[PDB]
Amino acid sequence: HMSYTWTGALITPCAAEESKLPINALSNSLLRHHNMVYATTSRSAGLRQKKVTFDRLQVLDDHYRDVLKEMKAKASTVKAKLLSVEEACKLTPPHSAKSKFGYGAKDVRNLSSKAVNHIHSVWKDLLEDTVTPIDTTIMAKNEVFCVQRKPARLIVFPDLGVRVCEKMALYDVVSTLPQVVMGSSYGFQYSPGQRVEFLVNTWKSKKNPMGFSYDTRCFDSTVTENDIRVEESIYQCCDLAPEARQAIKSLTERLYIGGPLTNSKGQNCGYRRCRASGVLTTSCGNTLTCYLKASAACRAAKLQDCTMLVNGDDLVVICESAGTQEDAASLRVFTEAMTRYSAPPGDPPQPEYDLELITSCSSNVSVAHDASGKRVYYLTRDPTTPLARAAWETARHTPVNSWLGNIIMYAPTLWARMILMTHFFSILLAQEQLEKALDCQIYGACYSIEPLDLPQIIERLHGLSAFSLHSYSPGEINRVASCLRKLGVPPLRVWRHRARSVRARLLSQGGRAATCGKYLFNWAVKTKLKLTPIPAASRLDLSGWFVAGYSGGDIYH
Ligand SMILES: O=c1c(C2=Nc3ccccc3S(=O)(=O)N2)c(O)c2cc(F)ccc2n1CCC1CC1
């Protein structure tokens, strides 16, 4: 029951790929250890293929079926609607990969006759045929990391026409069903601050809290045909139009369960029998399957008063401690059960008795103080990957601006405020591009955002306290400082000096620019200004933000 079979044809690129960090006049102001930063390319795709190709065995017991029955009971309450062709078209990113059949994303977005006629033909084919495997493209992702090299991850996706049809059939389902089935355990319904609140309140709900993260090794490749059919059975519990039931069956049989892999040159590379990383249901499917396996494993291990938090393949569990020795024993049983369910561990899970020591969604809770001196919890992460990616983006325009996503999601953090805000506002100022909209990605969806709207966006997501936090923990400060030394980034004292300059330059611009100076860089002046609620912030349409995850799902706004 192999995750993949291969022909020996290579996974090929679409254009020249760079692995070495490009350097321009701005690079050394941010990062001097250029050799630490690299991008993955198709040259490492063979190594990735070896890692993700293996046999999956699955033994399913009564705990698994009991949890599944409960999930299906909750799913039965969901009513989901078909999207119109127009609605689905307007969800397509402007720079989404063009179709092989003679039209592109902008043709889709404009509702061109050619595009709309083809989408109708694809839809009719889904209704009429529930058996023929749907072709997919396989490509090596180009992502940036700091050394200590990862092989490229693989992306697998069907044609643009099919992607639009997935939205028509499943957008409402994948946006609504997860929170109904999993309630407060569904992670993608939370902003960063909401996630912190849930984690803190859950920790406090236990007499003697214990928590752990669980890392499944190569999750997508552990997902079996069984798993994908079980997912479909959950979708079909919803109140759906008959037409939608048929399209969902067809997509499951023809696309989600598996299909042929074609490289960028049109050659057959092999066949997939595990999760595709580039379909609409990747996020919802991984979340449901992870929750199902983990909930059943909790029961196997007799964990007391378990509360889970699930975002795709990323899992956190907080429960009542039965003692340190008993806790470690329970985790072994948990892992054994997950392994039987085809979710074997990467790193073995570790019990933690301090909430700040748990990492999940690459992040941890930490504590700072607000302007009144109150202790406030907030979400942070190790800044190594953010800074490596920011270095790349200093010298190259990319389709997704990680620095922008990171400023939005980690606005309250020491590193996002002192380094990312300072560095990028200085660059944009110099080019007068503050008002130019940029694409970023949050929970898998693409947003087009004007940097000048950051103050209002931050206030809405994090509150005004994001502009006032200070007295960060020694642990957090020490981690940031050591990261800077590692990458050869100037120390925080240099960044404070630069932020005073950037703040003054923004204030001299007037308007929204001055608001950025005032709010984003109040921390850099000795005599702070008041900072009152921004009237524009109460006006922003942040509907669609933090409802669901759509990683690989080709979703825009
Ligand atoms: O977890 C993320 C995700 C995210 N997490 C995921 C976790 C598991 C599966 C799929 C995703 S995903 O591809 O949908 N995206 C982001 O897209 C993200 C983007 C930012 F710009 C900054 C931080 C981000 N974080 C950490 C923030 C923490 C509240 C959860």
361 Cα nearest atom in ligand 1: 1
DSSP one-letter code for 383: S
Beta bridge partners of 137: 157, 262
> How far is 502 from 334, CA to CA, in rounded Å?
51
Secondary structure (3-state) at 261: strand
Asked if residue 443 has its Cβ within 6 Å of ligand 1, the reply is yes
Method: X-ray
Could you give all domains of the chain from N- to C-terminal order, each with its CATH number?
1-55+133-158+258-273 (no CATH), 56-132+159-182+224-257+274-280 (no CATH), 183-223+281-361 (3.30.70.270), 362-557 (no CATH)
Radius of gyration in angstroms for the set of CA atoms belonging to the chain, rounded to a whole number: 24
**Do the beta carbons of residue 548 and residue 171 sit within 8 Å?**
no
Between helix 324-340 and helix 282-300 the angle, nearest 10°, is 130
Closest residue by CA, ligand 1 atom 14: 443
Report the distance separating Cα 232 and Cα 72, nearest Å: 11
CA distance 491 to 31: 11
User: What gap in Å lies between CA 516 and CA 507, rounded to an integer?
Assistant: 8
Q: From ligand 1's centre to the CA of 361, what distance in Å?
A: 6
Ligand 1 touching residue 363 (CB < 6 A)? yes
Give the C-alpha distances (Å, rounded to integers) separating 433 from 93, 208, 421, 511, 517.
Answer: 22, 52, 14, 14, 15
Distance of CA 273 to the CA centre of its chain: 23
d(Cα 542, Cα 535) in Å, to the nearest integer?
15
Cβ partners under 8 Å of residue 133, min gap 6: 254, 255, 258, 259, 260
Residue 253: DSSP 8-state: I
Distance between CA atoms of residues 537 and 548, nearest Å: 22
The one-character DSSP state at 22 is: P
Exposed e or buried b per residue across 188-204, where buried means at least 16 C-beta atoms within 10 angstroms of its C-beta: bbbbbbebbebbeebbe
Which residues fall within 8 angstroms of residue 430, CB to CB, at 6 or more apart?
none
Please spell the DSSP secondary structure of 493-533, one letter per residue: HHHHHHHHHHHHHHHHH-HHHHHHHHHHTGGGSSS------
Pocket lining: 415 vs ligand 1, CB cutoff 6 Å: no
Please state the φ and ψ torsions of residue 305, each to the nearest 5 degrees.
Answer: 60, 50
Decide: helix, strand or coil at residue 438.
Answer: strand
Q: How far apart are CA 258 and CA 131, in angstroms?
A: 11
Residues 6+ apart with CB under 8 A from 485: none
Question: How far, in whole angstroms, is CA 464 from its chain's centroid?
Answer: 25
CA separation for the pair 411, 189 (Å, rounded): 19
Task: Say if strands 438-442 and 445-449 run parallel, antiparallel, or are unpaired.
Answer: antiparallel
Nearest-atom index, ligand 1, CA of 402: 21
Any ligand 1 atom below 6 A from CB of 405: yes
Is the CB of 275 within 6 Å of ligand 1? Answer: no
Q: Does the beta carbon of 406 lie inside 6 Å of ligand 1?
A: yes
Buried b (16+ CB within 10 A) or exposed e, 485-512: eebebbebeebeebbeebbeebeeeeeb
Using DSSP, state whether 439 is helix, strand or coil: strand
Question: Ligand 1 centroid vs 405 CA: distance in angstroms?
Answer: 9
Task: List Cβ neighbours of 151 (8 Å cut-off, separation of 6 or more).
Answer: 40, 44, 45, 46, 47, 48, 51
Strand partners, 546: none
CA pair distance 336, 61, nearest whole angstrom: 13
Atom of ligand 1 nearest to the CA of 408: 21
Secondary structure (3-state) at 259: strand
Cα separation of 392 and 405, whole Å?
Answer: 15
Phi, psi torsion values for 341, nearest 5 degrees: -85, 5
Residue-by-residue DSSP string for 218-237 = THHHH--HHHHHHHHHHHTT
Scanning 23-159, the segments in alpha helix (DSSP H) are: 27-30, 45-52, 62-75, 85-90, 105-109, 113-128
Q: Using a 6 Å cutoff on CB, does residue 192 contact ligand 1? A: yes
Distance, CA of 279 to CA of 136 (rounded, Å): 10
DSSP for 150-195, written as a single string: PPPPEEEE--HHHHHHHHHHHHHHHHHHHHHHHGGGBGGG--HHHH
**For atom 30 of ligand 1, which residue has the closest CA?**
361
User: What is the 8-class DSSP label of residue 416?
Assistant: I
Regarding the beta carbon of 314 and ligand 1, being less than 6 Å apart is answered yes
Beta strands in 302-381 (DSSP E): 304-311, 314-320, 364-369, 375-380
Tell me the C-alpha distance between 110 and 46, whole Å.
39
CA–centroid distance, residue 286 to ligand 1 (Å): 14
* Annotated binding-site positions: 215, 313-314
Q: Please list, residue by residue across 541-553, b when 16 or more beta carbons sit within 10 angstroms of its beta carbon and e when fewer do.
A: eeeebbbbbbbbb
Q: Is 386 in the pocket of ligand 1 (CB under 6 A)?
A: no
Residue 194 CB less than 6 A away from ligand 1:
no
- The phi and psi torsions of 143 (rounded to 5 degrees) equal -120, 155
Q: Residue 385 carries which side chain, given as an amino acid letter?
A: T
The residue type found at 514 is A
**Alpha-carbon 50 to chain mean position:** 25
User: Atom of ligand 1 at shortest distance to CA of 552?
Assistant: 13
In units of Å, what resolution does this entry have? 1.6
Q: For residue 188, how far is its CA from the centre of ligand 1 (angstroms)?
A: 8
Q: Does ligand 1 come within 6 angstroms of the Cβ of 413? A: no
Binding residues for Mg(2+): 215, 313-314
Q: Are 442 and 405 in contact (CB under 8 A)?
A: yes
Rounded-to-integer distance, Cα 218 and Cα 233, Å: 24
